Every structure is written in C-alpha cells, then in structure tokens.
PDB file of C-alpha atoms in Angstrom:
ATOM      1  CA  UNK A1150     -19.993 -98.408  50.619  1.00 33.68           C
ATOM      2  CA  UNK A1151     -20.299 -94.711  49.744  1.00 32.57           C
ATOM      3  CA  UNK A1152     -20.194 -92.017  52.430  1.00 31.23           C
ATOM      4  CA  UNK A1153     -22.592 -89.133  51.296  1.00 30.81           C
ATOM      5  CA  UNK A1154     -26.180 -90.100  50.247  1.00 32.24           C
ATOM      6  CA  UNK A1155     -25.930 -93.297  52.302  1.00 26.55           C
ATOM      7  CA  UNK A1156     -25.757 -91.118  55.441  1.00 26.47           C
ATOM      8  CA  UNK A1157     -28.510 -88.638  54.578  1.00 26.18           C
ATOM      9  CA  UNK A1158     -32.117 -89.063  55.695  1.00 22.75           C
ATOM     10  CA  UNK A1159     -34.856 -87.238  53.714  1.00 26.68           C
ATOM     11  CA  UNK A1160     -37.283 -85.430  56.063  1.00 25.96           C
ATOM     12  CA  UNK A1161     -39.527 -83.061  54.116  1.00 25.99           C
ATOM     13  CA  UNK A1162     -40.502 -82.468  50.519  1.00 22.98           C
ATOM     14  CA  UNK A1163     -39.525 -78.890  49.482  1.00 21.22           C
ATOM     15  CA  UNK A1164     -40.917 -78.941  45.979  1.00 21.24           C
ATOM     16  CA  UNK A1165     -40.325 -79.806  42.315  1.00 22.51           C
ATOM     17  CA  UNK A1166     -37.292 -78.437  40.470  1.00 24.09           C
ATOM     18  CA  UNK A1167     -37.142 -77.635  36.723  1.00 25.41           C
ATOM     19  CA  UNK A1168     -35.878 -81.275  36.728  1.00 25.81           C
ATOM     20  CA  UNK A1169     -35.927 -83.437  39.850  1.00 25.14           C
ATOM     21  CA  UNK A1170     -37.484 -83.124  43.288  1.00 27.22           C
ATOM     22  CA  UNK A1171     -36.117 -81.070  46.171  1.00 27.12           C
ATOM     23  CA  UNK A1172     -35.984 -82.285  49.785  1.00 27.09           C
ATOM     24  CA  UNK A1173     -34.807 -81.157  53.199  1.00 28.13           C
ATOM     25  CA  UNK A1174     -32.438 -83.877  54.435  1.00 26.33           C
ATOM     26  CA  UNK A1175     -30.293 -84.417  57.524  1.00 22.79           C
ATOM     27  CA  UNK A1176     -26.547 -85.035  57.077  1.00 23.75           C
ATOM     28  CA  UNK A1177     -24.341 -85.508  60.172  1.00 24.13           C
ATOM     29  CA  UNK A1178     -27.171 -83.843  62.185  1.00 21.37           C
ATOM     30  CA  UNK A1179     -27.336 -80.765  59.914  1.00 21.25           C
ATOM     31  CA  UNK A1180     -30.043 -79.714  57.518  1.00 23.24           C
ATOM     32  CA  UNK A1181     -29.098 -79.984  53.836  1.00 22.95           C
ATOM     33  CA  UNK A1182     -31.018 -79.514  50.593  1.00 23.55           C
ATOM     34  CA  UNK A1183     -31.139 -82.571  48.336  1.00 26.79           C
ATOM     35  CA  UNK A1184     -32.210 -82.516  44.678  1.00 24.10           C
ATOM     36  CA  UNK A1185     -33.089 -86.001  43.403  1.00 24.10           C
ATOM     37  CA  UNK A1186     -33.262 -86.910  39.732  1.00 23.45           C
ATOM     38  CA  UNK A1187     -34.327 -90.136  38.070  1.00 23.79           C
ATOM     39  CA  UNK A1188     -32.114 -92.306  35.807  1.00 24.93           C
ATOM     40  CA  UNK A1189     -33.669 -90.734  32.671  1.00 29.19           C
ATOM     41  CA  UNK A1190     -32.690 -87.203  33.930  1.00 32.10           C
ATOM     42  CA  UNK A1191     -28.945 -88.108  34.091  1.00 36.19           C
ATOM     43  CA  UNK A1192     -27.949 -85.411  31.570  1.00 39.64           C
ATOM     44  CA  UNK A1193     -29.601 -82.638  33.623  1.00 40.13           C
ATOM     45  CA  UNK A1194     -28.137 -83.972  36.900  1.00 38.58           C
ATOM     46  CA  UNK A1195     -24.642 -84.393  35.404  1.00 41.40           C
ATOM     47  CA  UNK A1196     -24.615 -80.899  33.919  1.00 42.59           C
ATOM     48  CA  UNK A1197     -25.742 -79.252  37.167  1.00 41.14           C
ATOM     49  CA  UNK A1198     -23.080 -81.317  39.113  1.00 40.80           C
ATOM     50  CA  UNK A1199     -20.488 -80.135  36.526  1.00 42.95           C
ATOM     51  CA  UNK A1200     -21.403 -76.449  36.956  1.00 47.57           C
ATOM     52  CA  UNK A1201     -21.388 -76.644  40.758  1.00 47.32           C
ATOM     53  CA  UNK A1202     -17.972 -78.351  40.759  1.00 43.07           C
ATOM     54  CA  UNK A1203     -16.390 -75.514  38.728  1.00 43.16           C
ATOM     55  CA  UNK A1204     -12.958 -74.545  40.068  1.00 45.59           C
ATOM     56  CA  UNK A1205     -13.070 -71.552  42.450  1.00 44.12           C
ATOM     57  CA  UNK A1206     -16.843 -71.191  42.235  1.00 42.53           C
ATOM     58  CA  UNK A1207     -17.554 -70.986  45.982  1.00 45.28           C
ATOM     59  CA  UNK A1208     -18.654 -67.541  47.197  1.00 40.93           C
ATOM     60  CA  UNK A1209     -20.900 -66.259  49.975  1.00 36.01           C
ATOM     61  CA  UNK A1210     -23.501 -65.207  47.367  1.00 37.34           C
ATOM     62  CA  UNK A1211     -23.568 -68.530  45.432  1.00 38.45           C
ATOM     63  CA  UNK A1212     -25.366 -71.574  46.833  1.00 39.73           C
ATOM     64  CA  UNK A1213     -22.870 -73.815  48.619  1.00 42.53           C
ATOM     65  CA  UNK A1214     -22.554 -77.158  46.862  1.00 44.22           C
ATOM     66  CA  UNK A1215     -21.699 -80.225  48.964  1.00 44.38           C
ATOM     67  CA  UNK A1216     -21.711 -83.260  46.657  1.00 42.06           C
ATOM     68  CA  UNK A1217     -23.167 -85.253  43.814  1.00 42.09           C
ATOM     69  CA  UNK A1218     -23.941 -88.911  44.562  1.00 43.30           C
ATOM     70  CA  UNK A1219     -26.019 -91.964  43.589  1.00 42.37           C
ATOM     71  CA  UNK A1220     -28.376 -93.864  45.887  1.00 39.96           C
ATOM     72  CA  UNK A1221     -29.728 -97.310  44.883  1.00 39.18           C
ATOM     73  CA  UNK A1222     -32.840 -98.075  46.979  1.00 36.89           C
ATOM     74  CA  UNK A1223     -32.949-101.741  45.820  1.00 37.77           C
ATOM     75  CA  UNK A1224     -35.371-101.059  42.913  1.00 36.19           C
ATOM     76  CA  UNK A1225     -34.107 -97.938  41.137  1.00 36.70           C
ATOM     77  CA  UNK A1226     -31.139 -95.573  41.198  1.00 34.97           C
ATOM     78  CA  UNK A1227     -31.566 -91.988  42.428  1.00 33.35           C
ATOM     79  CA  UNK A1228     -29.116 -89.253  41.265  1.00 31.29           C
ATOM     80  CA  UNK A1229     -28.508 -86.763  44.076  1.00 31.64           C
ATOM     81  CA  UNK A1230     -27.205 -83.189  44.345  1.00 33.58           C
ATOM     82  CA  UNK A1231     -26.642 -82.053  47.953  1.00 32.87           C
ATOM     83  CA  UNK A1232     -26.266 -78.389  48.909  1.00 32.08           C
ATOM     84  CA  UNK A1233     -26.579 -76.034  51.851  1.00 33.23           C
ATOM     85  CA  UNK A1234     -30.088 -75.565  53.243  1.00 34.07           C
ATOM     86  CA  UNK A1235     -31.575 -72.069  53.644  1.00 32.52           C
ATOM     87  CA  UNK A1236     -34.744 -71.991  55.815  1.00 32.71           C
ATOM     88  CA  UNK A1237     -36.160 -68.787  54.240  1.00 31.94           C
ATOM     89  CA  UNK A1238     -36.162 -70.470  50.836  1.00 30.41           C
ATOM     90  CA  UNK A1239     -36.317 -68.298  47.736  1.00 34.77           C
ATOM     91  CA  UNK A1240     -36.219 -64.530  47.447  1.00 36.20           C
ATOM     92  CA  UNK A1241     -39.641 -64.931  45.785  1.00 35.03           C
ATOM     93  CA  UNK A1242     -41.002 -66.606  48.973  1.00 35.39           C
ATOM     94  CA  UNK A1243     -39.240 -64.075  51.229  1.00 32.80           C
ATOM     95  CA  UNK A1244     -40.664 -61.072  49.326  1.00 32.52           C
ATOM     96  CA  UNK A1245     -44.176 -62.560  49.406  1.00 31.81           C
ATOM     97  CA  UNK A1246     -43.926 -63.040  53.210  1.00 29.66           C
ATOM     98  CA  UNK A1247     -42.172 -59.859  54.271  1.00 31.27           C
ATOM     99  CA  UNK A1248     -41.587 -56.208  53.669  1.00 34.06           C
ATOM    100  CA  UNK A1249     -38.008 -54.976  53.983  1.00 28.70           C
ATOM    101  CA  UNK A1250     -36.381 -51.818  55.378  1.00 27.42           C
ATOM    102  CA  UNK A1251     -34.089 -49.598  53.231  1.00 27.55           C
ATOM    103  CA  UNK A1252     -31.112 -51.465  54.799  1.00 27.50           C
ATOM    104  CA  UNK A1253     -32.906 -54.819  54.113  1.00 28.11           C
ATOM    105  CA  UNK A1254     -33.484 -53.959  50.434  1.00 25.62           C
ATOM    106  CA  UNK A1255     -29.855 -52.835  49.924  1.00 25.89           C
ATOM    107  CA  UNK A1256     -28.542 -56.035  51.606  1.00 25.41           C
ATOM    108  CA  UNK A1257     -30.655 -58.192  49.240  1.00 30.75           C
ATOM    109  CA  UNK A1258     -29.754 -56.236  46.098  1.00 29.39           C
ATOM    110  CA  UNK A1259     -26.020 -55.854  46.837  1.00 26.72           C
ATOM    111  CA  UNK A1260     -25.646 -59.559  47.758  1.00 26.90           C
ATOM    112  CA  UNK A1261     -27.435 -60.598  44.502  1.00 28.65           C
ATOM    113  CA  UNK A1262     -25.213 -58.263  42.437  1.00 30.61           C
ATOM    114  CA  UNK A1263     -22.064 -59.571  44.283  1.00 32.15           C
ATOM    115  CA  UNK A1264     -23.007 -63.168  43.516  1.00 29.07           C
ATOM    116  CA  UNK A1265     -23.710 -62.322  39.861  1.00 29.51           C
ATOM    117  CA  UNK A1266     -20.460 -60.355  39.537  1.00 33.63           C
ATOM    118  CA  UNK A1267     -18.608 -63.403  40.910  1.00 33.58           C
ATOM    119  CA  UNK A1268     -20.425 -65.805  38.539  1.00 37.00           C
ATOM    120  CA  UNK A1269     -19.681 -63.475  35.546  1.00 35.03           C
ATOM    121  CA  UNK A1270     -16.016 -62.811  36.415  1.00 37.69           C
ATOM    122  CA  UNK A1271     -13.171 -64.838  34.989  1.00 39.86           C
ATOM    123  CA  UNK A1272     -10.423 -65.480  37.582  1.00 41.69           C
ATOM    124  CA  UNK A1273      -7.032 -66.114  35.919  1.00 39.41           C
ATOM    125  CA  UNK A1274      -4.484 -68.631  37.145  1.00 36.63           C
ATOM    126  CA  UNK A1275      -3.673 -72.340  37.553  1.00 36.54           C
ATOM    127  CA  UNK A1276      -6.798 -72.610  39.770  1.00 33.04           C
ATOM    128  CA  UNK A1277      -8.667 -70.149  37.588  1.00 32.45           C
ATOM    129  CA  UNK A1278     -12.423 -69.815  37.318  1.00 33.42           C
ATOM    130  CA  UNK A1279     -14.167 -69.413  33.921  1.00 33.60           C
ATOM    131  CA  UNK A1280     -16.770 -66.718  33.474  1.00 34.86           C
ATOM    132  CA  UNK A1281     -20.273 -68.213  33.840  1.00 35.30           C
ATOM    133  CA  UNK A1282     -23.675 -66.856  32.733  1.00 35.34           C
ATOM    134  CA  UNK A1283     -26.765 -68.120  34.555  1.00 30.17           C
ATOM    135  CA  UNK A1284     -29.459 -68.032  31.807  1.00 29.22           C
ATOM    136  CA  UNK A1285     -32.333 -68.467  34.287  1.00 25.85           C
ATOM    137  CA  UNK A1286     -31.940 -65.703  36.872  1.00 26.08           C
ATOM    138  CA  UNK A1287     -35.202 -64.928  38.708  1.00 27.95           C
ATOM    139  CA  UNK A1288     -36.463 -64.412  42.257  1.00 25.71           C
ATOM    140  CA  UNK A1289     -37.429 -68.132  42.545  1.00 26.40           C
ATOM    141  CA  UNK A1290     -33.742 -69.013  41.748  1.00 27.67           C
ATOM    142  CA  UNK A1291     -32.169 -66.807  44.468  1.00 29.86           C
ATOM    143  CA  UNK A1292     -32.231 -67.910  48.136  1.00 29.70           C
ATOM    144  CA  UNK A1293     -32.204 -65.783  51.256  1.00 30.85           C
ATOM    145  CA  UNK A1294     -29.800 -66.714  54.077  1.00 27.89           C
ATOM    146  CA  UNK A1295     -30.383 -66.258  57.840  1.00 28.12           C
ATOM    147  CA  UNK A1296     -28.207 -63.061  57.777  1.00 28.15           C
ATOM    148  CA  UNK A1297     -30.608 -61.389  55.274  1.00 29.31           C
ATOM    149  CA  UNK A1298     -28.231 -61.732  52.272  1.00 25.20           C
ATOM    150  CA  UNK A1299     -28.875 -63.679  49.052  1.00 26.42           C
ATOM    151  CA  UNK A1300     -27.186 -66.504  47.231  1.00 31.14           C
ATOM    152  CA  UNK A1301     -27.773 -67.413  43.594  1.00 26.85           C
ATOM    153  CA  UNK A1302     -28.962 -70.949  43.060  1.00 26.75           C
ATOM    154  CA  UNK A1303     -30.328 -73.218  40.302  1.00 27.74           C
ATOM    155  CA  UNK A1304     -27.162 -73.053  38.189  1.00 30.78           C
ATOM    156  CA  UNK A1305     -28.162 -76.069  36.034  1.00 32.84           C
ATOM    157  CA  UNK A1306     -28.738 -74.077  32.860  1.00 34.76           C
ATOM    158  CA  UNK A1307     -25.517 -72.046  33.136  1.00 38.82           C
ATOM    159  CA  UNK A1308     -22.889 -71.707  30.371  1.00 40.71           C
ATOM    160  CA  UNK A1309     -19.156 -71.342  30.885  1.00 42.19           C
ATOM    161  CA  UNK A1310     -16.700 -69.372  28.787  1.00 39.06           C
ATOM    162  CA  UNK A1311     -13.203 -70.172  27.463  1.00 39.26           C
ATOM    163  CA  UNK A1312     -11.783 -66.614  27.059  1.00 38.34           C
ATOM    164  CA  UNK A1313      -8.698 -67.451  24.987  1.00 39.60           C
ATOM    165  CA  UNK A1314     -10.964 -68.700  22.109  1.00 35.48           C
ATOM    166  CA  UNK A1315     -14.247 -66.817  22.965  1.00 36.62           C
ATOM    167  CA  UNK A1316     -16.133 -70.160  22.939  1.00 37.91           C
ATOM    168  CA  UNK A1317     -18.839 -71.565  25.249  1.00 40.03           C
ATOM    169  CA  UNK A1318     -18.575 -75.055  26.791  1.00 42.53           C
ATOM    170  CA  UNK A1319     -21.963 -76.342  25.497  1.00 47.15           C
ATOM    171  CA  UNK A1320     -23.957 -75.767  22.238  1.00 44.60           C
ATOM    172  CA  UNK A1321     -26.639 -73.427  23.664  1.00 44.55           C
ATOM    173  CA  UNK A1322     -30.311 -73.908  22.713  1.00 41.90           C
ATOM    174  CA  UNK A1323     -32.485 -70.876  22.085  1.00 40.73           C
ATOM    175  CA  UNK A1324     -34.804 -69.574  24.777  1.00 39.68           C
ATOM    176  CA  UNK A1325     -33.864 -71.761  27.677  1.00 39.66           C
ATOM    177  CA  UNK A1326     -34.976 -70.099  30.849  1.00 41.86           C
ATOM    178  CA  UNK A1327     -38.110 -68.666  32.341  1.00 44.11           C
ATOM    179  CA  UNK A1328     -40.062 -66.722  29.715  1.00 43.64           C
ATOM    180  CA  UNK A1329     -41.136 -63.855  31.977  1.00 44.79           C
ATOM    181  CA  UNK A1330     -37.486 -62.943  32.667  1.00 47.50           C
ATOM    182  CA  UNK A1331     -36.081 -63.429  29.123  1.00 46.63           C
ATOM    183  CA  UNK A1332     -34.225 -60.433  27.783  1.00 47.71           C
ATOM    184  CA  UNK A1333     -35.679 -58.669  24.704  1.00 47.51           C
ATOM    185  CA  UNK A1334     -32.923 -60.131  22.457  1.00 49.69           C
ATOM    186  CA  UNK A1335     -33.699 -63.646  23.760  1.00 46.98           C
ATOM    187  CA  UNK A1336     -37.464 -63.134  23.173  1.00 46.01           C
ATOM    188  CA  UNK A1337     -36.992 -61.922  19.566  1.00 47.52           C
ATOM    189  CA  UNK A1338     -34.113 -64.426  18.856  1.00 49.87           C
ATOM    190  CA  UNK A1339     -31.711 -61.622  17.769  1.00 49.31           C
ATOM    191  CA  UNK A1340     -29.215 -62.664  20.483  1.00 48.62           C
ATOM    192  CA  UNK A1341     -25.845 -63.820  19.136  1.00 50.00           C
ATOM    193  CA  UNK A1342     -25.429 -67.088  21.091  1.00 51.61           C
ATOM    194  CA  UNK A1343     -21.821 -67.522  19.907  1.00 53.01           C
ATOM    195  CA  UNK A1344     -20.995 -64.328  21.889  1.00 54.77           C
ATOM    196  CA  UNK A1345     -20.616 -65.127  25.620  1.00 51.86           C
ATOM    197  CA  UNK A1346     -20.967 -61.426  26.585  1.00 48.92           C
ATOM    198  CA  UNK A1347     -24.556 -61.639  25.190  1.00 46.57           C
ATOM    199  CA  UNK A1348     -25.459 -64.131  27.931  1.00 49.17           C
ATOM    200  CA  UNK A1349     -23.997 -61.936  30.703  1.00 48.41           C
ATOM    201  CA  UNK A1350     -26.019 -58.964  29.370  1.00 47.40           C
ATOM    202  CA  UNK A1351     -29.238 -61.078  29.335  1.00 46.08           C
ATOM    203  CA  UNK A1352     -28.610 -62.008  33.016  1.00 45.53           C
ATOM    204  CA  UNK A1353     -28.335 -58.247  33.876  1.00 48.01           C
ATOM    205  CA  UNK A1354     -31.789 -57.562  32.351  1.00 46.64           C
ATOM    206  CA  UNK A1355     -33.222 -60.324  34.571  1.00 46.70           C
ATOM    207  CA  UNK A1356     -31.414 -58.970  37.663  1.00 45.27           C
ATOM    208  CA  UNK A1357     -33.044 -55.576  36.932  1.00 47.72           C
ATOM    209  CA  UNK A1358     -36.452 -57.303  37.105  1.00 50.46           C
ATOM    210  CA  UNK A1359     -35.499 -58.942  40.438  1.00 50.12           C
ATOM    211  CA  UNK A1360     -34.421 -55.502  41.825  1.00 47.04           C
ATOM    212  CA  UNK A1361     -37.869 -54.179  40.903  1.00 45.67           C
ATOM    213  CA  UNK A1362     -39.483 -57.040  42.870  1.00 42.81           C
ATOM    214  CA  UNK A1363     -37.341 -56.204  45.935  1.00 42.71           C
ATOM    215  CA  UNK A1364     -37.940 -52.395  45.769  1.00 43.67           C
ATOM    216  CA  UNK A1365     -41.759 -52.851  45.798  1.00 45.81           C
ATOM    217  CA  UNK A1366     -41.297 -54.496  49.225  1.00 49.58           C
ATOM    218  CA  UNK A1367     -39.167 -51.693  50.688  1.00 52.14           C
ATOM    219  CA  UNK A1368     -41.471 -50.172  53.351  1.00 50.50           C
ATOM    220  CA  UNK A1369     -40.719 -46.498  54.368  1.00 53.11           C
ATOM    221  CA  UNK A1370     -43.122 -44.863  56.857  1.00 54.30           C
ATOM    222  CA  UNK A1371     -45.327 -47.972  56.504  1.00 53.44           C
ATOM    223  CA  UNK A1372     -45.715 -47.373  52.718  1.00 53.24           C
ATOM    224  CA  UNK A1373     -44.901 -50.196  50.235  1.00 51.97           C
ATOM    225  CA  UNK A1374     -46.344 -51.999  47.212  1.00 52.13           C
ATOM    226  CA  UNK A1375     -47.874 -55.484  47.239  1.00 53.93           C
ATOM    227  CA  UNK A1376     -45.677 -58.365  46.016  1.00 52.08           C
ATOM    228  CA  UNK A1377     -45.863 -58.917  42.260  1.00 50.40           C
ATOM    229  CA  UNK A1378     -43.855 -60.674  39.593  1.00 49.61           C
ATOM    230  CA  UNK A1379     -42.489 -58.430  36.815  1.00 50.51           C
ATOM    231  CA  UNK A1380     -45.110 -57.861  34.065  1.00 50.58           C
ATOM    232  CA  UNK A1381     -48.002 -59.015  36.367  1.00 49.69           C
ATOM    233  CA  UNK A1382     -49.988 -56.068  34.840  1.00 52.82           C
ATOM    234  CA  UNK A1383     -49.381 -57.117  31.180  1.00 52.26           C
ATOM    235  CA  UNK A1384     -49.095 -60.917  30.693  1.00 52.31           C
ATOM    236  CA  UNK A1385     -50.808 -64.126  31.965  1.00 53.81           C
ATOM    237  CA  UNK A1386     -49.321 -66.109  34.963  1.00 54.08           C
ATOM    238  CA  UNK A1387     -47.416 -68.682  32.816  1.00 53.80           C
ATOM    239  CA  UNK A1388     -46.731 -66.502  29.730  1.00 54.87           C
ATOM    240  CA  UNK A1389     -45.623 -67.686  26.303  1.00 58.10           C
ATOM    241  CA  UNK A1390     -42.604 -66.355  24.418  1.00 57.33           C
ATOM    242  CA  UNK A1391     -45.032 -64.629  22.004  1.00 59.08           C
ATOM    243  CA  UNK A1392     -46.993 -62.951  24.846  1.00 59.41           C
ATOM    244  CA  UNK A1393     -43.751 -61.681  26.387  1.00 58.53           C
ATOM    245  CA  UNK A1394     -42.253 -60.620  23.018  1.00 54.78           C
ATOM    246  CA  UNK A1395     -45.345 -58.532  22.152  1.00 56.28           C
ATOM    247  CA  UNK A1396     -45.020 -56.610  25.456  1.00 57.81           C
ATOM    248  CA  UNK A1397     -41.215 -56.335  25.838  1.00 59.26           C
ATOM    249  CA  UNK A1398     -40.062 -56.091  22.204  1.00 58.08           C
ATOM    250  CA  UNK A1399     -42.996 -54.659  20.237  1.00 51.74           C
ATOM    251  CA  UNK A1400     -44.770 -52.369  22.758  1.00 50.81           C
ATOM    252  CA  UNK A1401     -41.340 -51.828  24.464  1.00 51.31           C
ATOM    253  CA  UNK A1402     -42.787 -51.871  27.987  1.00 48.62           C
ATOM    254  CA  UNK A1403     -40.934 -52.463  31.238  1.00 45.56           C
ATOM    255  CA  UNK A1404     -42.236 -52.810  34.836  1.00 46.47           C
ATOM    256  CA  UNK A1405     -43.606 -49.497  36.135  1.00 51.46           C
ATOM    257  CA  UNK A1406     -41.448 -47.432  38.470  1.00 49.80           C
ATOM    258  CA  UNK A1407     -43.813 -45.975  41.178  1.00 47.56           C
ATOM    259  CA  UNK A1408     -43.659 -42.215  41.875  1.00 47.66           C
ATOM    260  CA  UNK A1409     -43.005 -42.843  45.603  1.00 49.88           C
ATOM    261  CA  UNK A1410     -39.508 -44.273  44.678  1.00 50.94           C
ATOM    262  CA  UNK A1411     -38.370 -40.697  43.800  1.00 51.75           C
ATOM    263  CA  UNK A1412     -38.790 -39.536  47.480  1.00 47.71           C
ATOM    264  CA  UNK A1413     -35.973 -41.773  48.864  1.00 49.13           C
ATOM    265  CA  UNK A1414     -32.256 -41.730  47.767  1.00 48.96           C
ATOM    266  CA  UNK A1415     -31.864 -45.560  48.146  1.00 47.13           C
ATOM    267  CA  UNK A1416     -35.018 -46.040  46.000  1.00 49.63           C
ATOM    268  CA  UNK A1417     -33.787 -43.431  43.454  1.00 53.85           C
ATOM    269  CA  UNK A1418     -30.447 -45.339  43.120  1.00 52.14           C
ATOM    270  CA  UNK A1419     -32.369 -48.689  42.763  1.00 52.68           C
ATOM    271  CA  UNK A1420     -34.778 -47.228  40.151  1.00 51.00           C
ATOM    272  CA  UNK A1421     -31.840 -45.837  38.107  1.00 51.30           C
ATOM    273  CA  UNK A1422     -30.064 -49.289  38.209  1.00 48.54           C
ATOM    274  CA  UNK A1423     -33.315 -50.915  36.951  1.00 49.31           C
ATOM    275  CA  UNK A1424     -33.588 -48.546  33.975  1.00 51.26           C
ATOM    276  CA  UNK A1425     -29.902 -49.153  33.169  1.00 47.25           C
ATOM    277  CA  UNK A1426     -30.487 -52.995  33.205  1.00 46.58           C
ATOM    278  CA  UNK A1427     -33.623 -52.704  31.007  1.00 47.17           C
ATOM    279  CA  UNK A1428     -32.208 -51.122  27.882  1.00 47.52           C
ATOM    280  CA  UNK A1429     -33.193 -53.083  24.808  1.00 50.28           C
ATOM    281  CA  UNK A1430     -29.554 -52.990  23.651  1.00 50.51           C
ATOM    282  CA  UNK A1431     -27.610 -55.410  25.863  1.00 50.67           C
ATOM    283  CA  UNK A1432     -24.350 -53.519  25.193  1.00 53.60           C
ATOM    284  CA  UNK A1433     -25.763 -50.406  26.978  1.00 55.04           C
ATOM    285  CA  UNK A1434     -26.628 -52.254  30.200  1.00 54.54           C
ATOM    286  CA  UNK A1435     -24.672 -51.891  33.442  1.00 54.33           C
ATOM    287  CA  UNK A1436     -22.277 -54.755  34.324  1.00 55.01           C
ATOM    288  CA  UNK A1437     -22.790 -56.700  37.574  1.00 53.51           C
ATOM    289  CA  UNK A1438     -19.418 -55.318  38.854  1.00 55.68           C
ATOM    290  CA  UNK A1439     -20.661 -51.718  38.258  1.00 55.63           C
ATOM    291  CA  UNK A1440     -23.917 -52.461  40.081  1.00 56.59           C
ATOM    292  CA  UNK A1441     -22.042 -54.050  43.016  1.00 58.17           C
ATOM    293  CA  UNK A1442     -19.863 -50.863  43.169  1.00 55.20           C
ATOM    294  CA  UNK A1443     -22.885 -48.503  43.142  1.00 51.58           C
ATOM    295  CA  UNK A1444     -24.711 -50.527  45.789  1.00 54.87           C
ATOM    296  CA  UNK A1445     -21.560 -50.897  47.992  1.00 57.90           C
ATOM    297  CA  UNK A1446     -21.307 -47.042  47.956  1.00 60.53           C
ATOM    298  CA  UNK A1447     -25.028 -46.851  48.906  1.00 61.22           C
ATOM    299  CA  UNK A1448     -24.722 -49.401  51.805  1.00 62.40           C
ATOM    300  CA  UNK A1449     -21.731 -47.337  53.110  1.00 63.40           C
ATOM    301  CA  UNK A1450     -23.586 -43.962  52.753  1.00 60.68           C
TER     302      UNK A1450
END
C-alpha cells in the first residue's frame, strides 16, 4: 500500500480552508499540517498540489510542501495535502495575540517580502522556476515560524507565468481572492488579466495592507495600536466587492497611517513602503525585490 497518508494520524482540527478542512497530524512522530478535500473538490485539491509541486519552489519563506495523497477510509476517498506544521499559525493569529518589537516587526515584514519576491521571480534554467502570483495574499494566508519569520501559504489560487509567450497557465476568473485585500484594479475590473505583471502588482497592494497590520502591533515605549484588519474603520466584517470598491476606488481611501509612526525610523520606512504599495496605478508600486532590499538595509542598520 501507499506510504504517506496511510502513516499519518489526525490529532486536532485546525479549521476550515477556502476548500477542505485543516488538521494537525502526526507523521513519523512529527507534527504536520494536513488539508483534506472531498471527492467533489478534486479540482481545487489538484490545482493546489500542482502549484506546490512547482520546480524550485521551496524557500524558507514559502510553506514547505510534503506530499499530495489519497486515503480511502472504506466508505469514501479523502484527497490530502500534507505540509509543514507551524504552531503559531497565521500572522493574523500572531498579531492578535502579541505585540512585536521593532526587530520583530522588521523580521516579519522582510521575511514576507522575501517569500513574495521568491514567488514572483522567474528562475531560468533546465530546473527553472516560473514566476507565480498569489492572488489571495492576506495575514490569514501567511504563517509565523518558531524563529519569528513568516512563510507564505495557501497557494491554491496562484497563477504561473510562461515568460517566452507572456501567457498564464490557467484562464483566470475575475475577482478571485479575499475582497478586503483586492487591489483597486481588481475591485473595479480594469485589471488586464492577460498581463501577468498585473497579478504581481495586485499582490504588492495586498502586502502593503499586511505591513500596515504588522506596524500597528510594533510596540515602542509600551505604545502600540490594537489589532485590526485593513479597512476595519470603513467596511463591514465580510465586505462585498461593491462596499470595497466604493471605499478604495471611488472615495480613494487607504488604511490610516498613525502620527506616532513618524517618530521612529523603522516605522517611517514601513509607512513609506505602504504608501508605495497603495498607489491606484499598479505600475507605480514597488516590486517585492525592491521592498526586500529596503527592509534588508533596515534590518542591517
């Protein structure tokens, strides 16, 4: 018989995924995360297995994929995705629980930007890696490791690019992703979905929102902001595309940058990155590589 799912024992329910159910399992005595899909969710499971098996994808700031497998319990078939387990869970959970130091904030932001720069970068060669855009970047889709660094997860909605032809591996549907984090051009449907660079630029807007969530939690002299999602002050908890479009596209609002962020160099650098991710024109936004470079210089200094 098989040698992956057969040997894993589910221990604790972690929660529901966009598709499937997430569990903490034990494999060869180690904790692993297991996402289980039903037979009717095969397309979602297969596509996420396909993205995670991309050549040369592995990176310290991308969730470590172990295997895809099937498990027949005697009544129905389960479709499994097994990955590394991170006890802290999501960056969203971590930021709700804790405040971070200046060093802590920089570690979280630089590791997120390093993972995004790796996802976005094409690596040439026989064992080359295509450029990939996430399409659903948010604090609930980033995990925090024991060492206080992040890894990007939930790659199931990603798209991959073939650079020689400037084509995308799937026929992308409009407005996939979490509405709160959708870029202005995604919200108003002006995005050119035949242009792969458009998807990278939309991910940068969302990373800007995540950086704002982290910076609120940076405590200096015991001073910090409470945890909030971006746009908590302007839209309902589960907002519609129309609610988001009216705020982001028509009123042209972005999350507020508190005055106290001007009194600290690390917070000034973070606030400037946010503004340069939030431009309505995707072509004016910073690239993930440029952000990684700015933050590497900040972690050093």
